[PDB]
Amino acid sequence: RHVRIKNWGSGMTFQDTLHHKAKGILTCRSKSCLGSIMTPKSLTRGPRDKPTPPDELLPQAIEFVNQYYGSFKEAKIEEHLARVEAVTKEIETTGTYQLTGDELIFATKQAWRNAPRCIGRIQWSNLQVFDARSCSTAREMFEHICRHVRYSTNNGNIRSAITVFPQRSDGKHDFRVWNAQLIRYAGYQMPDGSIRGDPANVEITQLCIDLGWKPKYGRFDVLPLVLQANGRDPELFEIPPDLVLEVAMEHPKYEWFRELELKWYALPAVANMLLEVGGLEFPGCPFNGWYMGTEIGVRDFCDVQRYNILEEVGRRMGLETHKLASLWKDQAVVEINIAVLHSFQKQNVTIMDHHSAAESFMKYMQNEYRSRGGCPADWIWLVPPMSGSITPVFHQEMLNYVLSPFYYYQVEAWKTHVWQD
Amino acid sequence: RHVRIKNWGSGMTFQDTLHHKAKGILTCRSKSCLGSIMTPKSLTRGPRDKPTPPDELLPQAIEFVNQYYGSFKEAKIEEHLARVEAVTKEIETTGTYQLTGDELIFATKQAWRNAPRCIGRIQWSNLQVFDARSCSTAREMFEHICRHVRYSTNNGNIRSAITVFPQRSDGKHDFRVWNAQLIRYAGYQMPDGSIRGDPANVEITQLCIDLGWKPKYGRFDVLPLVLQANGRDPELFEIPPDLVLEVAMEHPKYEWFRELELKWYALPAVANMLLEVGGLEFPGCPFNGWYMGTEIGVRDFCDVQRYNILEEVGRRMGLETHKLASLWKDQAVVEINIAVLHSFQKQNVTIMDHHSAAESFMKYMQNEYRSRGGCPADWIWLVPPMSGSITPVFHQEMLNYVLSPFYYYQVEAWKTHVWQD
Numbered sequence: 001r002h003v004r005i006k007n008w009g010s011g012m013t014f015q016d017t018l019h020h021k022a023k024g025i026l027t028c029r030s031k032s033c034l035g036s037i038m039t040p041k042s043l044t045r046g047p048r049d050k051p052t053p054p055d056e057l058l059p060q061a062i063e064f065v066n067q068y069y070g071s072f073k074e075a076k077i078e079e080h081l082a083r084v085e086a087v088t089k090e091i092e093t094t095g096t097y098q099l100t101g102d103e104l105i106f107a108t109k110q111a112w113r114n115a116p117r118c119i120g121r122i123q124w125s126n127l128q129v130f131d132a133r134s135c136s137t138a139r140e141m142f143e144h145i146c147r148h149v150r151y152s153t154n155n156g157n158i159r160s161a162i163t164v165f166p167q168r169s170d171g172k173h174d175f176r177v178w179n180a181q182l183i184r185y186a187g188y189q190m191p192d193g194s195i196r197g198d199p200a201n202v203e204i205t206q207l208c209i210d211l212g213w214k215p216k217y218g219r220f221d222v223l224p225l226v227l228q229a230n231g232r233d234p235e236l237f238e239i240p241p242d243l244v245l246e247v248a249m250e251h252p253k254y255e256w257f258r259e260l261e262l263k264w265y266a267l268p269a270v271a272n273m274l275l276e277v278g279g280l281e282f283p284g285c286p287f288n289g290w291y292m293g294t295e296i297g298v299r300d301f302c303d304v305q306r307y308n309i310l311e312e313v314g315r316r317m318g319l320e321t322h323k324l325a326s327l328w329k330d331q332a333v334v335e336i337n338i339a340v341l342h343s344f345q346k347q348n349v350t351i352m353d354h355h356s357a358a359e360s361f362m363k364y365m366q367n368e369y370r371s372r373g374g375c376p377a378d379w380i381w382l383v384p385p386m387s388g389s390i391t392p393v394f395h396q397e398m399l400n401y402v403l404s405p406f407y408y409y410q411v412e413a414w415k416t417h418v419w420q421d
Numbered sequence: 422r423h424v425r426i427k428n429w430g431s432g433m434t435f436q437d438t439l440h441h442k443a444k445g446i447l448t449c450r451s452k453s454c455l456g457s458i459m460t461p462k463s464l465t466r467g468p469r470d471k472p473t474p475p476d477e478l479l480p481q482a483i484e485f486v487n488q489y490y491g492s493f494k495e496a497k498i499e500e501h502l503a504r505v506e507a508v509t510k511e512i513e514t515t516g517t518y519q520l521t522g523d524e525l526i527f528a529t530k531q532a533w534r535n536a537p538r539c540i541g542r543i544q545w546s547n548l549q550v551f552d553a554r555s556c557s558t559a560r561e562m563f564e565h566i567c568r569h570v571r572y573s574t575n576n577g578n579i580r581s582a583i584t585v586f587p588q589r590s591d592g593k594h595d596f597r598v599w600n601a602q603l604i605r606y607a608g609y610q611m612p613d614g615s616i617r618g619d620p621a622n623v624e625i626t627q628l629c630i631d632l633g634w635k636p637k638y639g640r641f642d643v644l645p646l647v648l649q650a651n652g653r654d655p656e657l658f659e660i661p662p663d664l665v666l667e668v669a670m671e672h673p674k675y676e677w678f679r680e681l682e683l684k685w686y687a688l689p690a691v692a693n694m695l696l697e698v699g700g701l702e703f704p705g706c707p708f709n710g711w712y713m714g715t716e717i718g719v720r721d722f723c724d725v726q727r728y729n730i731l732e733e734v735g736r737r738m739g740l741e742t743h744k745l746a747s748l749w750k751d752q753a754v755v756e757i758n759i760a761v762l763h764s765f766q767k768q769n770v771t772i773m774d775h776h777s778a779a780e781s782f783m784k785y786m787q788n789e790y791r792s793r794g795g796c797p798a799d800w801i802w803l804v805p806p807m808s809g810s811i812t813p814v815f816h817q818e819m820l821n822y823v824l825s826p827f828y829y830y831q832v833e834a835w836k837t838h839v840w841q842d
């Protein structure tokens with residue numbers, strides 16, 4: 001029938017039925033729940049070296065069309081019918097189909113709306129879709145990315161956009177961006193072992209170096225794009241510096257914060273995910289929104305496996321960093337997340353705080369149930385990395401599940417890539 | 422056959438094989454994860470009006486005996502085997518069996534060990550077992566409870582202990598405590614519609630008033646113990662005042678914090694849970710450990726559905742509480758907690774901070790994997806309510822599964838209790 005979920009903070013309740021249309025791909029069983037695995041194969045869509053069998057594609061193609069037309073306020077039977085018929089015929093002779101513009105626009109938004117780990121989904125209906133499905137070379141890919149980057153940065157007043165590259169055909173002619181994000185910092189392996197910059201990008205930074213990129217050994221060096229057109233070997237392109245907007249970190253109270261000399265790019269763009277829609281697979285679809293303080297001030301800067309700066313910021317504040325009991329870490333993280341939120345506003349760049357963020361999610365979630373009796377959500381990913389229960393999401397029971405369209409993970413390209421040269 | 426989980430913060434990895442011995446009672450399926458439902462039926466063991474059938478009990482009885490005996494440094498072949506015959510004949514002639522003193526102790530410490538939601542499991546070895554299975558009256562329960570409260574408080578040097586009342590027989594003579602904790606403040610529904618005290622307890626506070634208790638309409642009024650002996654109607658017993666060690670809240674720097682007139686008890690003791698062991702169910706097993714700061718500072722004080730003191734302290738600090746983006750709520754929560762952890766240390770009462778607790782769990786978790794190659798863990802409860810990404814458990818992948826012995830949830834007595842008067 002349906003499972004009920006409650007909100008212990010508000011007392012509000014929802015009846016989720018949408019979950020019945022989910023895809024039986026999760027790994028949890030009545031014996032054990034595996035909801036805390038970060039990158040599960042269950043949420044990953046691997047590579048193929050052979051087209052998707054037309055037969056298997058047909059059921060899915062029909063399913064999407066149905067959903068597409070099932071979405072209209074006022075039905076359009078003829079078109080709906082005609083399309084089901086029209087698409088059945090195309091897959092028969094062609095062995096695959098093409099999405100109309102409106103369909104691609106619809107698919108990218110629903111896929112976003114169907115993103116369990118995203119808290120910004122309130123915007124799910126405001127997305128700029130760049131149709132680059134006719135692209136054919138690495139250089140083009142680059143120029144499209146630059147166009148996307150310019151539109152989204154919008155001089156600081158950031159906007160959500162996505163550029164969809166050619167869909168997967170036989171799986172051997174994949175168009176993919178190798179970096180995890182369009183804009184991200186290098187990570188250098190020093191001669192003494194220590195890492196320089198963002199330790200999370202060592203593997204990728206080395207690949208650029210091996211491919212001819214010149215290392216500068218900086219703390220905040222912008223990695224070049226490692227593009228792959230038509231399954232060819234990846235080529236390097238460097239995003240033009242003026243296109244990459246950054247923000248310098250400063251605390252409104254602590255005069256010394258700027259001496260730490262930190263900064264960060266303003267545009268957060270996921271570049272390596274795979275868009276799945278009606279049986280089609282677009283391994284090339286970089287998208288973006290705007291930042292949420294916590295992502296930078298807590299994760300990027302304070303994760304031990306990253307810039308790990310809590311130590312120093314504790315020293316500067318002169319807190320008793322010798323004993324945890326004093327909660328110096330908690331105090332520091334706060335000042336660090338206030339710096340990011342302040343700095344960004346001071347430079348007039350769009351950013352959001354976890355409070356406002358969590359708050360808009362609730363309105364969104366309430367609408368999702370009021371519209372389709374469902375909203376797939378992954379608690380572990382939605383609740384902010386600090387002040388967790390201060391935000392209303394921490395008290396929201398939720399169900400996680402995969403739908404369609406959907407944004408899947410992909411296996412690192414350099415792990416499965418056979419080098420032609 | 423196993424599941425690899427890792428810690429993205431340290432890179433350490435474990436292989437879990439213990440989840441295979443778990444009970445298939447979870448509700449997660451391949452089509453949807455429900456790991457975030459707070460008080461699920463899966464984790465609850467409700468009432469019944471007939472005794473546990475022997476055909477279903479025997480297996481479980483034996484399985485426990487094997488498990489208990491398989492926990493010895495050196496096997497006790499004869500004892501182990503003889504014990505199985507005894508339980509069988511016993512279950513065969515009376516339709517049930519009695520555990521021994523050592524088996525009971527084993528069961529409780531083991532149950533604690535399998536509590537996925539307890540972050541303080543590193544202490545499972547140190548537990549005091551008060552045998553009250555020969556109990557037979559509400560006043561006798563009251564006495565046992567006061568005995569427990571005294572041994573545990575130990576004048577500030579808290580000690581973990583558990584009291585076990587009679588095991589369940591036919592299911593109509595249940596020995597249980599209706600409250601959720603041996604110590605807990607009342608919730609008064611005022612006439613203006615507001616709530617005085619702990620709003621989390623409006624229902625039990627009323628049931629008390631309905632049972633002759635006199636309301637003092639205070640802000641921290643210790644509630645009486647509603648005791649159900651031998652399935653009879655409940656009866657109130659007031660825990661002797663000052664047999665209730667409490668802590669007054671003071672902030673090391675903010676001298677105005679005292680003026681808030683806040684305090685909390687020092688003994689955290691769950692009372693309304695059921696202990697399942699070898700097929701036997703013990704509906705009355707109150708036990709306690711010692712508070713972890715956040716329990717009081719983050720949740721008890723700041724949850725809007727609780728004392729909700731977040732704004733009032735925000736105005737005291739002068740923080741711009743009208744702009745979420747200023748992170749004023751985050752400023753508050755930290756100080757409130759700084760306070761909580763400070764007070765306890767001041768009156769010399771055992772308290773543990775969320776950082777040190779996490780640090781120890783990681784230690785326990787490695788031990789548990791080396792040892793039993795498993796560790797049922799519920800991520801959603803282990804990550805602290807404030808400063809998540811700062812603790813190691815936040816980047817720790819884990820598996821949540823139900824083993825045996827086990828501490829289950831029960832249906833609030835008053836909803837199912839058939840009154841006599």
Ligand code: HEC
Nearest residue numbers: 108112115117118119120123160287288289290291292407
């Ligand atoms: C409107 C601005 C906006 C905000 C704010 C926003 N998102 Fe998301 N978002 C995702 C996906 C997919 C994930 C999950 C990322 C992952 O698993 O690595 C995500 C994750 C996140 C996360 C968690 C990331 C982490 O690593 O902790 C935050 C925070 C977030 N989004 C904020 C697709 C989108 C899309 C795609 C059309 C858009 C537009 C989008 N998101 C727009 C936004």
Ligand code: HEC
Nearest residue numbers: 533536538539540541544581583708709710711712713828
């Ligand atoms: C005899 C069993 C037992 C002992 C002893 C015990 N715990 Fe637990 N603990 C539990 C169980 C069961 C739960 C889950 C409670 C629930 O789901 O309501 C729990 C939950 C918790 C929680 C989270 C619950 C919440 O409501 O936020 C914390 C924090 C905790 N324990 C700390 C400790 C500490 C610190 C100690 C002392 C070393 C301790 N525990 C000793 C059984 C125990």
Ligand SMILES: C[C@@H](O)[C@@H](O)C1CNc2nc(N)[nH]c(=O)c2N1
Nearest residue numbers: 036037038380381815816817818
């Ligand atoms: C323990 C593991 O699941 C972990 O790395 C998590 C949990 N929740 C998260 N939630 C978000 N939004 N982003 C993350 O990277 C993570 N990582």
Ligand SMILES: C[C@@H](O)[C@@H](O)C1CNc2nc(N)[nH]c(=O)c2N1
Nearest residue numbers: 394395396397457458459801802
């Ligand atoms: C499930 C969610 O909606 C929520 O109520 C949570 C999450 N984590 C928790 N963790 C602990 N330790 N105690 C709780 O009561 C909760 N509640």
Ligand SMILES: [Zn+2]
Nearest residue numbers: 028033449454
């Ligand atoms: Zn699950």
